[PDB]
Structures are given as structure tokens and as C-alpha cells.
Design an enzyme around this catalytic site. Sequence first.
Site, PDB file in Angstrom:
ATOM      1  N   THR A  10       0.807  -1.343   0.012  1.00 27.07           N
ATOM      2  CA  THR A  10      -0.028  -0.085  -0.039  1.00 27.07           C
ATOM      3  C   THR A  10       0.854   1.369   0.171  1.00 27.07           C
ATOM      4  OG1 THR A  10      -1.865  -1.198   1.263  1.00 27.07           O
ATOM      5  CG2 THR A  10      -1.813   1.105   1.214  1.00 27.07           C
ATOM      6  N   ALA A  43      -5.662  -4.862   6.676  1.00 26.43           N
ATOM      7  CA  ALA A  43      -6.662  -4.851   5.794  1.00 26.43           C
ATOM      8  C   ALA A  43      -7.952  -5.153   6.418  1.00 26.43           C
ATOM      9  CB  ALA A  43      -6.661  -5.890   4.517  1.00 26.43           C
TER      10      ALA A  43
END
EC number: 3.4.25.1
Lengths: 230, 233, 234, 232, 234, 234, 200, 213, 216
Positions: free
Chosen positions: G1, G49
Site C-alpha cells: 500500500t 486490511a
Amino acid sequence: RGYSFSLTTFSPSGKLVQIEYALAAVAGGAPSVGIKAANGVVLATEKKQKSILYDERSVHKVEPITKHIGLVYSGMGPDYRVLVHRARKLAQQYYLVYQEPIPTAQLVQRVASVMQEYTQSGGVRPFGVSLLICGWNEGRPYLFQSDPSGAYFAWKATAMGKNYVNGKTFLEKRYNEDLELEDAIHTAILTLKESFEGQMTEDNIEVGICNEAGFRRLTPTEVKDYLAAI
Amino acid sequence: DRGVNTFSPEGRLFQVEYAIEAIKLGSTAIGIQTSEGVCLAVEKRITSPLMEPSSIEKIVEIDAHIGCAMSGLIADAKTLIDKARVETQNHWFTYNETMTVESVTQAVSNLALQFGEEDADPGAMSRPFGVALLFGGVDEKGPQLFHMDPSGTFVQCDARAIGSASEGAQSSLQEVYHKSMTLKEAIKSSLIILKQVMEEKLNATNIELATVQPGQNFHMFTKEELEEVIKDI
Amino acid sequence: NQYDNDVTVWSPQGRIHQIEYAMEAVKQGSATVGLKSKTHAVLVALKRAQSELAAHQKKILHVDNHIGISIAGLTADARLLCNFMRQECLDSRFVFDRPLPVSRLVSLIGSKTQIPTQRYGRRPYGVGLLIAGYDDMGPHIFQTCPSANYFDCRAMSIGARSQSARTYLERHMSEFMECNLDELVKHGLRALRETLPAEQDLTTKNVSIGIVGKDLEFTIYDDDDVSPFLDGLE
Amino acid sequence: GYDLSASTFSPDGRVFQVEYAMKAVENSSTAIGIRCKDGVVFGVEKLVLSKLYEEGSNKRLFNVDRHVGMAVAGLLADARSLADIAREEASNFRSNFGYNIPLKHLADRVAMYVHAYTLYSAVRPFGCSFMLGSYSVNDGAQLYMIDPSGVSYGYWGCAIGKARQAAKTEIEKLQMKEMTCRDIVKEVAKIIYIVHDEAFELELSWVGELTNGRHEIVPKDIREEAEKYAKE
Amino acid sequence: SRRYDSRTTIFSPEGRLYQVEYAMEAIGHAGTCLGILANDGVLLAAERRNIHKLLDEVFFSEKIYKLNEDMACSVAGITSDANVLTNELRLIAQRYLLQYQEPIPCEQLVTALCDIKQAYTQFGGKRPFGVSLLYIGWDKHYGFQLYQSDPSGNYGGWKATCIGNNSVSMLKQDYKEGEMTLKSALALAIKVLNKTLSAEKVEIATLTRENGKTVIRVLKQKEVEQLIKKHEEE
Amino acid sequence: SYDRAITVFSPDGHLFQVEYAQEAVKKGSTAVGVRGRDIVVLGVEKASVAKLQDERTVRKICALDDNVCMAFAGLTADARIVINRARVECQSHRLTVEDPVTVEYITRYIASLKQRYTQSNGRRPFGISALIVGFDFDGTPRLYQTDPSGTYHAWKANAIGRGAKSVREFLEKNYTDDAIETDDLTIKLVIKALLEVVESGGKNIELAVMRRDQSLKILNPEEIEKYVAEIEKE
Amino acid sequence: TTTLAFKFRHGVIVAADSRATAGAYIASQTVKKVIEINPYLLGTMAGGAADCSFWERLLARQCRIYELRNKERISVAAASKLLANMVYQYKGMGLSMGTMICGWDKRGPGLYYVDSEGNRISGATFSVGSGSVYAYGVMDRGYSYDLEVEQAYDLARRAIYQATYRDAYSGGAVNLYHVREDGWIRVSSDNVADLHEKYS
Amino acid sequence: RFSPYVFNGGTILAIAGEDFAIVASDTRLSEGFSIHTRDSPKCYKLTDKTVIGCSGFHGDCLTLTKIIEARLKMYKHSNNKAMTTGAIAAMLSTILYSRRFFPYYVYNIIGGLDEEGKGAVYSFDPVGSYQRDSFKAGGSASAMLQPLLDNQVGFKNMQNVEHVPLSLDRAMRLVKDVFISAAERDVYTGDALRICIVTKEGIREETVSLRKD
Amino acid sequence: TQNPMVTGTSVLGVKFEGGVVIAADMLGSYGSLARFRNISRIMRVNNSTMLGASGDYADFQYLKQVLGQMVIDEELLGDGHSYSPRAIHSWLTRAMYSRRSKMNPLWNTMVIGGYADGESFLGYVDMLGVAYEAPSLATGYGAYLAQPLLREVLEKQPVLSQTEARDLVERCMRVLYYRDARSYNRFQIATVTEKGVEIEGPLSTETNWDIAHMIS
């Protein structure tokens, strides 16, 4: 379980209806005198049972609170025994935190504090026992009385129970500020002798003194001794 | 007296059949389910003219596609309108979709007949919620409105009147609705408010109207839209 | 009437004085009828329309995975009781992984609605369930009551003027333990078609029925699906 | 108005919420229980209202601990409640102390449960008289009977219900001590058919040497053998 | 039971509170102890119970109670309740110190006690605290100040208000609001108590200072025999 | 732990405890406010506090944080609890969103609080009624008036005290557009409105103004006199 | 990310990548790592997540409750503040997240940064993520407040293009958002390879 | 001191076509080095149009299917409407997250088809993060089946093959060859995959064996 | 974990045309000390279901009093409706998963079996909650040692008569006497059939030590 609403409440006149009934139940109780004296007190009371059938060494009315503080009542029977239970417990909280025998004034603070919430707090009726307190506490003796309201006052002499107006007037007549040892016992005996309903038996009275060495009950051979010296 | 959880020598609870009253007290609201929407209106009964009329909230949007219309004892609904919207976003949160109208109406009406004196912790209710309301909403089944009671009874409705005009306005609404919207149910419902009139000829200050249409989400009508409709009558 | 502060008190004869009055509060409710065959038990309910028009306050309810009910009394209290019955029926699906038997179901709700009859200031669950399901043996049917006293019955009717439906249905028990679904539900609708005020029809709107038994889920027949059940002229 | 609360006495010492519960089992049918040397035989009167109720629509001979029984009289909701907490009580005894529950302790336990439940204005008394009964291999055929007051006595032939004024006389004239329970199962029908003075579709259960400390609805054959005590 | 509750927390149909104004009539039976402030400090002036010899020694009386180094309070009405609450409010005073290391400016204390006493008349179903006690105190923020409260809950700065029987109207024709000169405040106190008297049957107590720290004096015996001969006429 | 349901539905939908609180706000002071289009203004005819009051602690006018401030009317000691909880949650709403907290939200908190005391078990819903005035992020001098039933209205005069039905019909008569100026005509309208009821402002009235999210200024009786004189001169 | 966001004279760009690792094996090449809580604000995700997805999901619930309850658009400082309150009162429990809360409100372009430790700071520009400091470098070389729309888009595409090129735990695609006084829009779904052939 | 998880193994696959969703499975649950059984399904028929796959720790997989089954039933007659597929994915995301701090160590894949009819497949980490895909096997041979149907389904890193949409014959032959390959190469093989396949008309379930070792 | 708990070793079982037979040795091994010899590890429940235990025996006495109390309690409701071995397996599964879910776990690892209305049943319930069904089961080191002899014959023919299954588990129990260290000679063999649960204990193993005298 429980109620959590107070049954003691205010009259439309503006007074507590249950507390004056409690002082009525005190005033219908057994008469008891208490005389503050220059070194020590005497707290006499009257144990008239139904017949000559019971054990007069079984139940007491003079009984100490753990160090040097006795307390005698006039009125309801077992509500007194609850107040002795609570009073001994409060004196032992105080003794385990401050490591001295409790001052008499503070014991009357806490006993009057526990008798207050039974004028409130959920369905309980007030005790209806106006017990009186003794105690040597350092230097000069103390004497108090916790009414079933929760008030308390200190003095030099009082009576309670039956016909206590005669006890208060009679002790107002015969009291001296130096009147100190066994003469107080004398006038206490002739305050219970005033009515007694008859014959002044040593098994029907018991006294308790606070003669600078702890509160102690008097043995039945000592009251009859001064009943021989009347 | 007697308590709240007691049954009456008629047959029903005391507090429930007393909660059917204080619905005659209070303002009147009406709603019409159509085939392409559902319209709600309420004459919110302004007392004085010294004042501001556009903050009497009687058309309250639960979600974007559920709008309620309460009456009766006003502002007693705010706890269950709060439960309606909190339950709504809980449903969208945990299930990632829209709702029905019988799920919000299912969830609110469980709180109606849920009270009592001696029960669990004192955050519970004592009196029943004395507010009758109805959720105008659009679904994937169809547009529909669910009329609640204070008893927890909720019913399917397509033309329902509450408030003080629960007899004459309901009987008038019984004979004037069968077909569909085609823009004129909202103009043949304020006409029922026009027959109801208590204090003032139903201008755009004393009635609040809002429709829920399947294309949009809802539309709380502003002033010039309202007086655009009132000019047509 | 000092017996108005009153699910703690006893009338001096024997009467508890308001949880029989909750039985009055389900006499006031709408009429219904359930019955059982040797194979599959059925439920039939007429639905009152006290409005413009409605779904007529849908009575018979899905609780289950073949243990269906038929309420008749308060509706919010009924929905509370079937969220209880529903939730612990699913709890018996969860733990034991078998169908919860109908008798233990109706007995423990018979112990759940029995607690407010006992204690103070809490009204009884004023709803008369008419539960019906198919466990291992034959398809049982239980009236229970707000007096928390269920009945292992067959062919019971409760609600408004349902006594006439009982006295039809009492004198027609001989053609039970036979009489398959197509001719059974006709025999229940012509038992329901006496509680109506003597004017002609069990319409498709107000009649909602439910079927449960051998090799079929508890199945609700609403406004459309009741139309294949049609016969009788009286 | 010294009525309507179990925490308030009469002016002559008689808690009226208990004696109003006592007549509340006197308006319900009989259930007799007869002790003999091989066990205790119960028999309950049934007052079948309509034809709509099937056989055993309401159980009134419950069992509790795989050997003690529950011939009940009054409100079946209250009797069923204390039946299931008697089940939980013998459950806590067998789970707690291992040894199978002697009946005297269970009758004293359920007895003080339903008594201590009559000391408060926040509860009503129960409205159900009921009786127990079993025998262990060295117990004797113990049975007890418990009132809504909470008093529990050991009996021989106790009978509770509406017609217990009739029912106590025949059980007293029946020979009590020394017969071997099968005949008295048969003889129970004679008591039930005498005291029923009006469908009387009765029901019997026992514990005995034919059972070895259990309960059975009869098995099912004396229902067509003790039915043949009609015309007496 | 709901037949038994006194229902203290109910509005009258006239809107008032029945158990609260019954406490206001409890003050008029027993109650004295006015309080006067000056540019200098503030004093209470009090009455004991009766003439009844039989009273050995009070350390402080049953009337004037010490609360901090710079506050004190006096008590009307029922003496059993207020003792409790004054110990209660005494706790409040000390815990403000524990929270702030300040000597608790007295309006905080009066606000706290009036909030809990309002809480006893708000809910809980109990009787209210039947005492209209009042307070004297000093803070660094304001000057010498006295507050006065009642069993209803409200309070105020009540510069010369007395409590109990025979109600203060003469004081609101005699008090000079600008300057008072606390010796003449003693003179006005024995004036008012001389109309409504040695320390057998009076209990007067002053609050003054020296070099910043406050001094609470209980005005020992012979000072009262000074002021009682400070009259001729009045 | 007191659990008696006090606020219960009587017959004919009348919730008697709330209307008893309506007389309890009918028997108070006479509070009044005017939304004057750039300013807001209050006023509450006070009693004889000059005889021996302290004007600092007779305040019917309080302040919530800086901009919103309210004038209660009724029972004057149940109000201070609502003041305290309004200040507490107002600081919490400064904690989360960090605004000059809008007047709509805090008056919804007050109305929701009093409605939560029309619901809970035995706690006597309040006998107060507010004048929540103030501003927001962009001017908008909004006024709000709550109710013991927890209903708040965004009106513009709301004289809700004791003799204030005459004041609100007077303010219905005499508030159209003449008070759109800065302060003088608005404050003149308020002191005219309360001089309708009682006597002169040298002993009776006190006011408070609020200007554009600064300077909540009360008016001492020297300044009130000028306005009163102007009104008298008329 | 590797997320990224920067405000200027026309709203604020929020860009992010689209890969989601599992330590070393990677799960998806197309992950919606920008949460659209309403059509006026946004919110990103930077690790953990399910943590970040649950707490901006729940932030969407709470802000929608604010929309219903006080009939106004929520201020961005309120949403970032209450996020910092709840994930603050789960501090130390192994919770690990980090986000932008951008979006136009009645005062400004917004762009607060809220993470697991509860920083809750305002900003002119940020880029939170695994590598992400690469993004800082290249973004802060070409950033100015006086940009127009197109080279701001190319500043984001080149910015997290290089931040996904050099880093290992990033890549996939790039979505880009330019919120201003109408709500968010979407301007891209390009992947890394077409940016590589686009820009050599 | 206790280690409350083991890894009972198993690999489950689901493919989303255009009117179907091939939810594959395997059979052999096994920990340590000894196998337990060869019967055990891992695709569970939730609704008629939703099939879960569920791999990882088998007891917690089992309890998780009990929870999502019983709460599907708790939904279905609380709104009088069956679940969709994305709503199953959402509530299973909050069931997996709701016990985070002692997590459901389970890799589960929800196949099925949408409201309009097109098939979808939601993938999950053991703490709950749903993405709809058209592939992504999970759980033991996760990193083995994934690059094949990254290529033979997604057509990535692949020039102009003129890729056609999938069907119940090409994707049918694409599930059996990957599980005989993972039957060769993984240890947690499976001996008989039970492909719960979903379609518009209903549901059927093909079974065929594998490398049994 | 904290103490040398008193364990067993193995309850191995196989189903057959007819019913299902499970077998276990009576041993109370206190950590390499056969402290308790005559100790039954085969619980009888209602007449169509059986139950073993391999791990901690104290937890098996806890389970025999909660299974016993539950099955007599629902046994005395009358109305038929005894527990199928579906429900003992599922209840025991949820009891153990709900027991390790609070990290206070039951440590025994049993197999329950029984003949239902139609066919037999042989289900495994693990310490952790790993529960399943199988044609033939074994617990502990039997799952390493008895399990190959069981899933060899049952891969050839999945149909057994009662004598073939009984000799099969007698032979497997002899193998666990040979190889498992925590194993004792005598053992209870126990079979549930159409006529119900019956327990034939205790038996012995005919040992074959004839290979011993070829060691030099």
C-alpha cells in the site's frame, strides 16, 4: 426484593410521624437511669421479666462496646441488639485503622449516623430504641444518648423509659457537680426505687460503671451489697 | 393507582388504550402510497404568528428512502426515531444494502410495548410511547407506508390518516384513492387538509409535505414548491 | 375492586383474577383454526381488516424450520414471544444440530410465559398461540394460552366466536387421520367459515393458511396461493 | 383489607394468601397416591373438556429424577414450574453429591422452596398441591405431599384435589400395608370411579419391583383391566 | 407495593411539592441562628434548645459546625438529618482540596450540597433533607460572604437572613449595606436575638482573621456577658 | 432503585405529571427574550433583592459557554442541574467537532434530556422552561424555547414566565420590523414588555445582551435606568 | 500500500495503489483502497486490511448518523476526530491502520491524517503506506499550491508511480480522486505498465 | 502452553463466469502427518444461490458455517426476504472481524451469483476483507492454483489470444486439471474434489477423484 | 499442562453391517506409571449411542456426569425423542469448541459411536473441536498405529460382519499392546447393535513374543 422507598415521611403539620411514634415506643419501655459523675458514670436499668422463671445471667442490658464504652437502652428489645452489633463493628473499624480505643463522641457520631438511614432508605422503620452511651475517654468521662431520630446530647444525668419526667426532675433536684463514686450509684438505685413496681430485687436491676479502668458490668453480689446498704 | 402492566375490564391494557388517546390530541398527518411514490403531509398547527414556523419537525427522514410522519404527543418519538436511524445504519453497516420498511417498522414497534415498573435497570421506559406514526418509504418490493400504533401493532397501508382527523379525513380518503400518483395524489391530499382546516387556509407556512419517489431518494418540499401546489387549488 | 393491583393477588374463591382475564384478552382476538391429519397438520387463519385495506395484520408466522405458529391476541407481545421461540429454536439448530421437538418447544415457552404470571407488576403475555409442527412422530398441534397452560390438542379453534368453529370441528373428527391435503384444508376452511358474521365469503384477501408435515417445509399460503382452495357454498 | 398480600397477617394470625391458594387446588380434580410395601402407585383423575384434546393432552403424572413422581392437583402452570425446578434440584444433587437423591431431602427442599416463596409481597404463593413418591433398594416406599403453604408430610394414602373429602375414606378402608402393588393398581380404579360423581379418562403411574425404581404410564394393559371396574 | 409508597416525588395539582413545603414548616418549629456580614468578617448568632440544666459541655455546639479553615455552617430544622449531610458536605470540601489544592471557595460547596439535596428531592422516593442550613465563608476571589439554602434546593447570598421562626423583616430596615463594622454587627445580632440571654441560652460565633488566615471563634462565655450588658435601651 | 412508574397515561390521553409541570412553570418568574436580528436580549422581573439580596447569586440569567445562554422559569433549583449537564455536554461537543457550538444542538440536548425524564422510572420530569438564545458559525441569532414535555420551538418572543401570556400577546402585537436595528429598539421592546407587568427597573428588571459571538454583557441597574427613562418618556 | 493526497487551489487529489500483500505472497492486484463515505468526503486505508476497512466502514456509519441527526454535512475535523477517539480507545491492542480523511467542507479542503497511535493532524500533503516515503520525495519536488488540475494529476501519477516502482509491497493500478465543491470524482483506473509505456 | 490452532489443511476454489460460479473443494482434512478422513466436504450450500468454501482450522470452519447458516436463517424471516450474495459477504466480514482478538483462523471463499444473475466470488483473509473477483482459490494450495487461473482465466501477461468468455465446459475442464496438479504437488491434496457448481436454474454437484496418497 | 494428568491412550472403533464396535484399554497411566488398572473408559448412554475417551480421565468423568445428566433429563420427558448420535456428537463438539474458545479446554479426545434408526455412526470429537465422521476411527497413537489396519481392510471391502470387525479391533488392540508404551494388557471391547449397547470387558491379548530369541 426490597422496597427502596422511605416509609418515614413528613406530616402535613411538618414533622416526622414515625419518629414521634418511635419516642412513644421508647417511652413505653423499661425505665433506665444514667448518671455522669466526676470520675466515672453509672448506667442503671431495670430487668423485670414476666415470672421468676428466667435466667437473669443470660441476657444483659449493660454490655460494653469492646474497650471502655457500655450502652444501655429503653424500648424495643432486639433492635437494641442490632445497635450493639453495629456499634461493636464500628468501634472495631475505628480500632483497626487508628490503633486506639474509640473516643466516645465519635462512637456516638457513627451510631447516630447508622440510626439515621433507618429514618429513610427503603421500607425500614426506625429503630425505636433511645439507648444511652458511657465512656471514660481521656481525662473526663462522657455520656450521650442516641434517640431513634438520630440526635444526641451530652449531660450530667438522665432517665428514660417509663415515667422519665420524674427521673429528669428528680435528677435535676439531686445532682452535684463533684458527686463522684457510689453516691451516684446510690441515687441511681433510689431513682429506680422510685417506681420499680415493687420490692427492689437485685436480680431485677443491673448497673454498669466506667471507673477509669474500662466499662464493666457489676456482679450480682455487688448490687445486692448496696441493696443491703440502703 | 394501579400500575402500568394491568389489563382493563374492557379487555385490553390500561396504558395502551390510554395511549390510543393523546393521538386525537395533536396535529393530523396523512400519507398516500402510490404506484410511483408515497406522499406525506402534516398540518403542524402553529400557535402564534409572532414566530418561525419552519422548525416544527413532523416530517422526519429516517434514511434517504424512509421518511416518517408522527403526530400525537410530539417529541416522544425522538428516542424511537433515534432507534430507527441507528438501526437503519446498523443494517446498512452489517449487511451492505438498503432496507425494507417492515424491518425499520419491525424494529421500532418492538420498542412500543416494552415498558414496566419493576424490571431491569432504570434506563427502561415507564409509559408507552404515546406517538402514532407511519413510515413512508420506497423499497425493491414497492413504495408503501406502514401505519404504527402505540400498541406495537403496525399494518400495511396505502391511504392512512392519523391525528385528530382520523375519522372524517380517513372516510374522505377512503373514497378518493384507487389508481396511482400521476402527480395529483399530492394535490388531492392537501385537498383533504383543505377540508380539515383549523386555523388558516393551508398556505406554505402551516403544512409540511414530503414525497418519497423511487427515482430520487426523498424530497422534503421547500416553500415555493408548496405554494406552487397551493396556487393550483 | 381491590383485586385490580392484581397479578399477585387471589380472589377468595380460587381465582387469580386477571390471567384468566388475559384468556378473555385472547377471546377478544381474531378467529383461527388449526388441525392435524395422520400425516401433516394445517393451520388456517382469517385476518381482520380494521382499516382502509391492508395485509390485514398477518397472523400465522414463520418461526422455524417446520414448527409454525398462529397468533391471536396482542401483536407486539406475540412478536416478542416468537422472537423468543424463534431464537431458541435456532439455538437448538445450533447446538444439538437436530430439529427441536415440538413438545419441548411448547413446554419451555410454557415456562417462559409463566414467570410474569408469578412475579409482581408484570402482565402475562396476552396472546393465544396455536402452534403446529411435525417432529419425529405425527404432526402435533398445541394451543397454549396466556395462563401458561398449553394443551396437546387436535383440531383446536381460538379467537372471536371460535366456539362455533369448535362445535363444527368437534363433530367432524372421524374423518381425521385420513383425508389428504386437498380435502383436508377444505375441511378446515368449512370449519373456519362459521366464525364469520353469517354473510358469505372466505375471500382470498383475509384467509392466510399454513401447511406443515411429512416431506414439506412449513409453508405459508398468502393472498394468492389460497385461491386454489375454493369450495363450499354455505 | 388484611387480605391480598402474603407479607401481612390476619388479626388472628392467618396469612390469607395461603388459604386462598388452598381452595385454589380444591377446585381441581383428584390425584390419589397409595403406598404399599413394593412401591407407590399414583392415579390421577382427568376432566377431559372436549373431544379435541388427545390422550395425555396435559401430563399430570410428571417424573423428576428417573424415580420420584409428580401427581399434581392445582394450576398446571405452577405445578409444571416446580416440577421442572424439582428436576433441576435432583440434577444439582446427583451432579453435586453423586449419590442418587433420597426423597425426604427432595421433599424438604422443594417444600422450603415453595414455603420461602410465600414470605414476600413481591411474589404470589403457588396454587398447586402435589405429591412425590419412589423407593430406593433400602429406602422404603417413601412418598410425601406438599401444600401451597409449603408443609410436607410423609403419608401412606394421601389424596389431593376436589373430591378428597370422599377419596380419603376408601383409601382408609383399603388394606394398606402388606399387598404387592399390582392389585392396588387395579384397586386404584375403584377409588377413582367412586370419587367421580358426574369423561373421567384416568391415568396411572407407579414405581415398584416390576419397575426397579422407575416410572411408567401403566404399561398399557390395566387401562383395559381396571376399566373393568365399572358397575361397582 | 404501590399502595404503600408515600410518593414524595410528585407535583401537586397546584404545581408545588408536598414533601418539600412540609420541610419548610419544619423550619418554623425549631430554628434561630441569624448571620450578619460586615466589611470585616461574618457571624452566626444562635439559640440552644431550652433551659434544662443537665448539659455538661459542648466542644462546639449542636448548631455551629466547622467545615474548613475558612468556612462554617449553622443548622435549622431536623437535627438528625443535617449532621449526616454536613459530614457529607465536609467530605466535598476536602476532596476539592484533593482535586485542586485550593481552600474551596464556598459557592462551589453550596452548589454541590444543593445539587445532592436536590437529587434527594428529585428521585429515589425518599424524604427530603429537612434542614434549611446556611453557610459562612471566605475565598480569595470574593469577600467575606454567607450563603443560605433550604430543603427545596435553591440558595443565595442572603446578607442578613435568619432562618426558623419569627421572620428577619426588622433586619431589612436596619442593616447598612455599605459598611457595618462587625462590633456593631454583634450589637445588631443581640438586638434581634434580644427581641426573638447569656451563653446558657444563646450560641453566637464569629469569623474574623489575622494576617491572611481566617479565625473562627465560638465567642467563649464571658464575651456574652459583656454584650448582654451592652444595651440599656435597644 | 425506586421504580414506580410516575409519569403515566391517565384517561383521555392526559399525561398529568407534565401538565402539573406546566403549572410549575406557570408559577415562576417572568422571563422574556427577543431575537433582534443582529442581537438577542433577555429579561426576568426579579423580586426584592435590593432589600437584602446578593445580585450575583439571584441570576435567572446564566451562561452555557460563551454564546448560548438561557433564562429558566420555574422551581429555580431543578434548573441548575440542567444548566450543569448543558455545560458538560456542551464542552463534550467542543471536544468532538470543535465549533462555536450551535444553539439548535444544545437545545435538542435539553429537550431530549427532559423527555428522558418523562420516561424513566420514578424521577418527576422537570418544572423548568428555557430560552436558549445565541448564535452559530454565521450570525443567525436563533432563539429556542423548551418545555417540560421536551418540545422545543424556534420562536422569536416566547415570554413563558408567570404573567407572560399577556407579554406574548403584547409581543405578538408589537414586533414586526421596528426592532431590526442594533440594540436600542429591541431592548426598549423588552423593557416595555416587562414594564407592562410590574414596576420600575431600579428594583425589578435585569437584562442581558449578546452580540455576534462576543461579550455576553449584563446590564447593571444604573444603565437599565436610562432605557427605562426613555421608555417612560415615550 | 502506498496512498497519497495533497490539496491545492482546486480541492485535493487522493491517489492510491491497488495491491494487498499477505507478508510476501500477494492477494489482489485490484483493491479499492479509497473508501467513499459519502459523495462529499473520502477516506484511505494503509495496512491491516480488515482493521482499516472496518474502521472506515464504521466511520461511514457514524458520519451518516451525524448527517441524519444534525441535518448538515459533517465537518471533516469531526470525522477525523471521532475516528481518532475510537481507534485511540483501542490503542495497544495490536491495531494498525492509518488514513487520510479528505473532503471539502464549509471551511477548507480538509485532509486530516489519522492513524493507529492517534496522531490526528491537519496537513497540506501526505502519503501514508508501507514504503510511501518515496512518494513524499517525488511529490514534494513537484508540489506547489499554485498548480492547475492536469499537472496535479500527473504529479500524483508520477508520484505513486515511482513509489510503486521502487517499493516492492505496492503496485497494481492507480486510482485517483479530485474532490472539490461538488464531491469526489474518479479520473483514473490506470495500471503501472501503461504508465510505464506512457512515460518511458 | 496449549496452541489453540492447528492447520487441518484443504484447498478450495471458486470461479465466477457470467451465469455460474464453480465453487471447487477438496476432501482430506489432516494435521501433523496423519490424515483423518476422506469424506469431508468444504463447499457448503448456504442458499440456493450462494455456496461457501471454507478451509483452514476445521473446527472453527465448522462453527463459522453454523453461525453464518443460523444467522442467514435469522435474517430470512426477519425481513421475509432471502440473503443476496454481497450481503452474505458483508455480514461474514463483520463476523470474522467481530472476533478479531482471538481470530477465526479460516480462509473462506463465497461463490454464488448476484441479483441480476452474473456470478461473483468473494475472497477473505481470516479477519475479514472481501473483494469480488472471478477466481482466487484459497487456504492450503493458495499459492499454487492462483498463477494458473491468473493466466487461463484472467489472461494476464499474455498477448492477443483473442480471449473468449468462460463457460461450463472450458471452466469445467479448468478445475479438474488444477486439482490433479495440486494433487501431485501439494501435500494437503484432497482425494476427491466435490465441485459445488451454481447456475441460474439451480444447483448441482459433480464429484471426481484425485491422486489418493 | 500444569501437572501429570491421569490419561488413557486410545479408543479405536469401526462400524459394520449391523452396528459399531469401539474398544479401549483400561489404564490410568499417571505419566509413565500405571497407577490405575481397573478403570473403565467406555461410557454407556441411551441404548443407541456409545462414548469413549483417550486423553485426561478427570475431564471424562466431568463429561460422563454432564452427558449422563443430560440424557436422563431429556430421557424423562416421555414423548419418545431420545438422542440420535447426531446430537451427542454435535453437542460434544459445541461443548469443546465453546470450551477452548475461553482457553479453559477439555483435554480428552474421544470417539462417540452408535447405531441410529437406519444405519450406524462413528464420529470423532477432538480436544480442539475438530469433529467429523469416518468409517473407522482411532485416537492417540492408535491414530498412527491402529488406523493403518483399519483403513486397509475398509478400503478393500467397506462391509463387515460382526465377527470380522470384532477380530479386527482385537488385532489392532494387540498391535497397540505391542508398540504403544502407554498401553495395558486387558481391555474392554464394546459393541452397539440393533439390540442396543453392550460392553464385554475385560478381555486379553494373546501375545506373540516368539521373535525374541533371535537377538544377539
